Structures are given as structure tokens and as C-alpha cells.
Design a protein around this ligand. Structure first.
Ligand code: MG
Length: 268
């Protein structure tokens, strides 16, 4: 094991969105001593992710925005981008749905209509700490690489086909990690983001430990040699992952880290 990657909502975080900082801090210092890298891979905004690791932000790596933004040692390594024409097309399509509330995710900040219901904005603010109200989605001065819709992820199945023909591969729907639908650039998933870090570190999936719970973790868990599904993980995720651990309210992710440190099952 040379890399441990975890994803946040429903994994590293309990339902109250907190984690055991003292225990994790002690574990991290040991991982550092052993030269093992730590990576946070989540659909959440980069700026929201670092709020969870104030003391370690420049030491650990991040695969944010479900894979569209990657940071290593406090420095941006890569970011995806929709062409201006692509973003116009996607936004135009979303605007055709009158009951939809959504957020446009960019490099410098995320954006939401100044007229979107407060309840929706309040929920999104929990995942995008840099969230700016705009008067129009089409005049945004930023590079956009993701969208977050107020549609339940349970509806993905009814949504892929509609989106496939309306957007045609410009973007694909996947779970946001917190119950709703993210529209991402095809190929810019967590595994792809993790590969950029591995390539830079000259390591392989062979040395990777990944922990997840939902659909946006599929390629990450399929890629890692030591794949773990949280006890609360969705069925298809428990099927994809080779190993299991306790649920997110019982420090399931920290227990995987402990298994690495003490070399217990599955590490031998
Ligand atoms: Mg999750």
C-alpha cells in the first residue's frame, strides 16, 4: 500500500458530516512516516473539501468535483473544462426544465441563480463553500466543468437516456455523493483523477487503497487493488469492491486505515 484514497459523503464523514479528528490525525502521522500518501476523492467542491482538513490541506491530495479538479501538495495539478459552446448548450438544455434548480460549477467558484429557492441554495452551500448568486447562467466569467441538479439520484436511470440525446456525451449524469445528480464531463471521474496523481508519483493502481459508498465511486473502486465498500454502501458498490468495512457512522473508513497500519485482513 502506497496510496489511500477516500471518498467523503457517506464514507469518511458520518451522517452529521464530521469525523474523529484525533484518531485520524494520529493515523495520518503514521502513514506519513511510512511514506504513504493520502487522497480525498469526492464530488464536492475543492474549497469545501479543504475545510475538512484545515491542518493538512497542503500535505494531502484532492480529487474534487467528482474528478474534474485535482490538487497535489497544495497546488492545482489539473482541471477539466467545457468549451464555451458546450456550456451554452448544456445550460440551454437545463433551462428547458421549469422545475429544475441547479448549480454551475467552475474553477474559481460555483454559481446559482439569485432566484433559486433558499432551501436549495442552503443545501448546495454545504457542498460548495464558494457559491455565488448570478442573474444569468449564460454570462459566467469562469471555466465550467460540472453541474449539480436538484434531481434525486434515484432518477438517474430515467435521466441518462433523456440526457444522452439532449446533450449527447457532452456530459453524463452520476450521483453527487449526497443524494442528487451531478453532470460531469465523460471520463473525468475519480479514477481518472487518481491516475493523474499516480502518474506523477510513478505508482500504480497496484499500490492503491480506495474507500467508497456510492455510484460516483464505481471506477475508483474497480481500479484500486484494495477496494473497500462502506457498510452503508449501495449494492452495486459492495459488488464492485473486493473488501468491506463498517458503515460511515462507525468510523468505517478509519478502520480501513487501521488495517493498513496494523497489517490485518485483507493486507495479510
Ligand atoms: Mg460518498
Amino acid at each position: 500500500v502506497k496510496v489511500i484514497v477516500t471518498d467523503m459523503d457517506g464514507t469518511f464523514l458520518n451522517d452529521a458530516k464530521t469525523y474523529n479528528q484525533p484518531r485520524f490525525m494520529a493515523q495520518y502521522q503514521e502513514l506519513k512516516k511510512r511514506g504513504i500518501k493520502f487522497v480525498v476523492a469526492s464530488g464536492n467542491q475543492y474549497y469545501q473539501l479543504i475545510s475538512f482538513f484545515p491542518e493538512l490541506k497542503d500535505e494531502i491530495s484532492f480529487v474534487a468535483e467528482n474528478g474534474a479538479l485535482v490538487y497535489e501538495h497544495g497546488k492545482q495539478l489539473f482541471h477539466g473544462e467545457l468549451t464555451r459552446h458546450e456550456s451554452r448548450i448544456v445550460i440551454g438544455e437545463l433551462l428547458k426544465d421549469k422545475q429544475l434548480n441547479f448549480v454551475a460549477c467552475g474553477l474559481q467558484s460555483a454559481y446559482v441563480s439569485e432566484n433559486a429557492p433558499e432551501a436549495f441554495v442552503a443545501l448546495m452551500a454545504k457542498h460548495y463553500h464558494r457559491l455565488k448568486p448570478v442573474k444569468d447562467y449564460q454570462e459566467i466569467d469562469d471555466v465550467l466543468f460540472k453541474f449539480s441538479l436538484n434531481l434525486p439520484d434515484e432518477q438517474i436511470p430515467l435521466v441518462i437516456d433523456k440526457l444522452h440525446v439532449a446533450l449527447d456525451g457532452i456530459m453524463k449524469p452520476v450521483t453527487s455523493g449526497f443524494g442528487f445528480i451531478d453532470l460531469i464531463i465523460p471520463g473525468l471521474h475519480k479514477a481518472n483523477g487518481i491516475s493523474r496523481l499516480l502518474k506523477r508519483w510513478d505508482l500504480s493502481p497496484q499500490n492503491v487503497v480506495a474507500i467508497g459508498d456510492s455510484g460516483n465511486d464505481a471506477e475508483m473502486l474497480k481500479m484500486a487493488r484494495y477496494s473497500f465498500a462502506m457498510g452503508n454502501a449501495a449494492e452495486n458498490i459492495k459488488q464492485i469492491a473486493r473488501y468491506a468495512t463498517d458503515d460511515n457512522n462507525h468510523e468505517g473508513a478509519l478502520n480501513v486505515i487501521q488495517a493498513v497500519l496494523d497489517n490485518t485482513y485483507p493486507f495479510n
